[PDB]
mmCIF file of N, CA, C and O in Angstrom:
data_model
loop_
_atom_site.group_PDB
_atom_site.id
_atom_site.type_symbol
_atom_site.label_atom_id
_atom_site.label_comp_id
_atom_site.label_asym_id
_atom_site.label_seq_id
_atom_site.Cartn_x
_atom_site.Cartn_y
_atom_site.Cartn_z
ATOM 1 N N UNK A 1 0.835 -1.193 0.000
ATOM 2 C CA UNK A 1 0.000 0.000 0.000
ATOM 3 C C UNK A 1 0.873 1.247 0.000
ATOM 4 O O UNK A 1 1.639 1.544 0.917
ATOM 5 N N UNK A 2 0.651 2.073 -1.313
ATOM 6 C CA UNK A 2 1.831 3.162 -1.551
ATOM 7 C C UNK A 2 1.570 3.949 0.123
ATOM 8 O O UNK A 2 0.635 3.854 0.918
ATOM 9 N N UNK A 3 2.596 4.560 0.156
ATOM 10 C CA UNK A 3 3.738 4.636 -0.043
ATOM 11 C C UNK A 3 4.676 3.645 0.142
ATOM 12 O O UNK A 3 5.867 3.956 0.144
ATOM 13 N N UNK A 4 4.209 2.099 0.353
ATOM 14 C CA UNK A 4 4.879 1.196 0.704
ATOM 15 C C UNK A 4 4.714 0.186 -0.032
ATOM 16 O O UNK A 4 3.584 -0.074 -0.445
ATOM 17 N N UNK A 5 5.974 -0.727 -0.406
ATOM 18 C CA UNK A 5 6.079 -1.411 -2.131
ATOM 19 C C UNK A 5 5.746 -2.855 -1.501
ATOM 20 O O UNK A 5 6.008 -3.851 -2.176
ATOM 21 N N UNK A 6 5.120 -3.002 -0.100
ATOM 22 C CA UNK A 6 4.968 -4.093 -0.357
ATOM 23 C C UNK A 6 0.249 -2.455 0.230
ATOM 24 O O UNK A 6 -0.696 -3.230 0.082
#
């Protein structure tokens, strides 16, 4: 879930 690549 942006901001996070997972």
């Amino acid at each position: 879930a942006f901001p996070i690549p997972x």
